[PDB]
Amino acid sequence: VNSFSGYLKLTDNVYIKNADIVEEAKKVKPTVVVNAANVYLKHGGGVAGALNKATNNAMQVESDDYIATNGPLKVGGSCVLSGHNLAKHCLHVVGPNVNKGEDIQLLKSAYENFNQHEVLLAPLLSAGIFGADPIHSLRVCVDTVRTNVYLAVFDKNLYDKLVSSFL
Ligand SMILES: Cc1sc2ncnc(Sc3ccccc3C(=O)O)c2c1C
């Protein structure tokens, strides 16, 4: 039993809800919230901008120190940093960016990072400003993640298309 409330169950391990991921995190304080990061951990917009703004820029300050020490992430890669006021940990995961020209096959590699955590709150990787089709992202998630993932989708209308088209 966990405190995630009101999610539709898609499979044995994948759940989905129309919700603000920042509000879900603020409400649930999960062990792990996933950020839709880029390789430079520059949290400008989308999920990343919203998460970082909710931490009062502390996520960005921590991230800049991480990059100064370690250099950029790989597309498809991840790092674990603090969850600040939102979660115990934030798993920063880099899905491929279609608006940058990155190969969508790396989306599976990106989702594999979730398997290192038993339970996660997460957005749909590579969707939104990263350019990929959210329906495809959901399919890759279901076919790749084996741990318990709670997907928060902010837009009610997008949330409806994903449910109604789910195989
Ligand atoms: C202020 C908040 S909370 C939040 N929680 C989740 N996703 C997004 S944006 C997003 C990212 C990837 C796939 C779909 C969407 C979507 O349109 O729902 C957001 C935004 C902008």
Curated annotation (Swiss-Prot):
Enzymatic reactions: Thiol-dependent hydrolysis of ester, thioester, amide, peptide and isopeptide bonds formed by the C-terminal Gly of ubiquitin (a 76-residue protein attached to proteins as an intracellular targeting signal)
Localization terms from the record: Host endoplasmic reticulum membrane
Membrane topology designation: Multi-pass membrane protein
Annotated ranges, domain Macro: 1-167
Activity regulation info: Inhibited in vitro by GRL-0617.
Record's function text: Responsible for the cleavages located at the N-terminus of the replicase polyprotein. Participates together with nsp4 in the assembly of virally-induced cytoplasmic double-membrane vesicles necessary for viral replication. Antagonizes innate immune induction of type I interferon by blocking the phosphorylation, dimerization and subsequent nuclear translocation of host IRF3. Also prevents host NF-kappa-B signaling. In addition, PL-PRO possesses a deubiquitinating/deISGylating activity and processes both 'Lys-48'- and 'Lys-63'-linked polyubiquitin chains from cellular substrates.
Assembly description: May form homohexamers. Interacts with N protein.
Protein name: Papain-like protease nsp3
Organism: Severe acute respiratory syndrome coronavirus 2 (2019-nCoV)
